[PDB]
Design an enzyme around this catalytic site. Structure first.
Site, PDB file in Angstrom:
ATOM      1  N   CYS A 104      54.350  87.627 -35.850  1.00  0.00           N
ATOM      2  CA  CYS A 104      55.314  88.878 -35.745  1.00  0.00           C
ATOM      3  C   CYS A 104      54.109  89.493 -35.030  1.00  0.00           C
ATOM      4  O   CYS A 104      53.631  89.521 -34.388  1.00  0.00           O
ATOM      5  CB  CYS A 104      55.679  88.331 -36.716  1.00  0.00           C
ATOM      6  SG  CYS A 104      56.570  89.815 -37.200  1.00  0.00           S
ATOM      7  N   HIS A 124      55.979  89.286 -31.933  1.00  0.00           N
ATOM      8  CA  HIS A 124      56.994  89.737 -32.213  1.00  0.00           C
ATOM      9  C   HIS A 124      56.776  90.337 -30.957  1.00  0.00           C
ATOM     10  O   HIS A 124      56.566  91.365 -30.050  1.00  0.00           O
ATOM     11  CB  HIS A 124      57.169  90.361 -33.298  1.00  0.00           C
ATOM     12  CG  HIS A 124      59.024  90.824 -33.091  1.00  0.00           C
ATOM     13  ND1 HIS A 124      59.838  91.656 -32.294  1.00  0.00           N
ATOM     14  CD2 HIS A 124      59.890  90.424 -34.458  1.00  0.00           C
ATOM     15  CE1 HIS A 124      60.596  91.988 -33.348  1.00  0.00           C
ATOM     16  NE2 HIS A 124      60.911  90.838 -34.020  1.00  0.00           N
TER      17      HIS A 124
END
Lengths: 186, 186
Positions: A104, A124
């Site tokens: 992420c 992400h």
């Protein structure tokens, strides 16, 4: 047994954190959830409060670890990026050719600590610009990316895939398959 | 805002617990993580330790809730099944036509408390026999099953789908879609 260090900072994404911890323990990995700021409970991004197993100060004296895991969460990753202890742990892991896994926003701490430059990485989507500042990595939109000892992934929805990639790297394909089946993955 | 009660017992599956809590909070639901046994930290199935927001004793005085959520974990579900407080909360939720959501082994607490008999339900595959003892439900292998106000799901790998089904039921399809996109789901 293989050993994992999961570094837990205030503002970590709790799904990013718990899915890898749980899946690694299902694989028979010895996982230490280490609190960046000490052994006190950590308030994650969506307000889940997790009690670490140890402080990072203590856990770093019990290494080395077969994998160092950096959860996401934009504000958790910021804390990881600002820590001298994290810098030292990652540098030492890279120098000993140990796996480093980040999900992420977590990979942006690799950038902050100058780790694994030249690797193919994912993050992400909202963390791409931060990760790519200076062009030190090559970007990927794959759900999990592994370039040698740098393993990255995109978000909560890719966290099972990420965790199973860590399992495969440490304990092999068959153990990953065995752990995967009871999870009821699509 | 809608309100969710998540009942957290020793031995709960931490992924089952955290994914719905986090996704519901992303949806603007007010989530109370209530400790079955009190406000002390809870040791989940894979040893993640979660601090509840409140004891169940206290949280049950602050209802009613738009959804009551029962995480899985075989030994967490056993504790839920054995609790008189859980029986009373579920009976009252059913009587007021409030949503009840349970995942993995969690639906077996519905059986223990005689809730929602005659509903179509799913569980973790390994919990099917327990759930079906006496033939009081009709079984489904769908990843998420919803029969009126009884919402069930299968395992850690179906927990995003489960959580988004709760979001859709409480806050609508558009909010569920909005919450889903940043999760990077397959």
């Amino acid at each position: 047994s293989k050993r994992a260090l999961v570094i837990l900072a205030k503002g970590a994404e709790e799904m990013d954190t718990v899915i890898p911890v749980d899946v690694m323990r299902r694989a028979g990995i010895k996982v230490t959830v280490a609190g960046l700021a000490g052994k006190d409970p950590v308030q994650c991004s969506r307000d889940v409060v997790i009690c670490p197993d140890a402080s990072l100060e203590d856990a770093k004296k019990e290494g080395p670890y077969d994998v160092v895991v950096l959860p996401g969460g934009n504000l958790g990753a910021q804390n990881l990026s600002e820590s001298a202890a994290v810098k030292e742990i990652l540098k030492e892991q890279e120098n000993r050719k140990g796996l480093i896994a980040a999900i992420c926003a977590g990979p942006t701490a690799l950038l902050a600590h100058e780790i694994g430059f030249g690797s193919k990485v994912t993050t992400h989507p909202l963390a791409k610009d931060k990760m790519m500042n200076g062009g030190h990595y090559t970007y990927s939109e794959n759900r999990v990316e592994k370039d040698g000892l740098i393993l990255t992934s995109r978000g909560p929805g890719t966290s099972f895939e990420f965790a199973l990639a860590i399992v495969e790297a440490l304990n092999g394909k068959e153990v990953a398959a065995q752990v995967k089946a009871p999870l009821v993955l699509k």
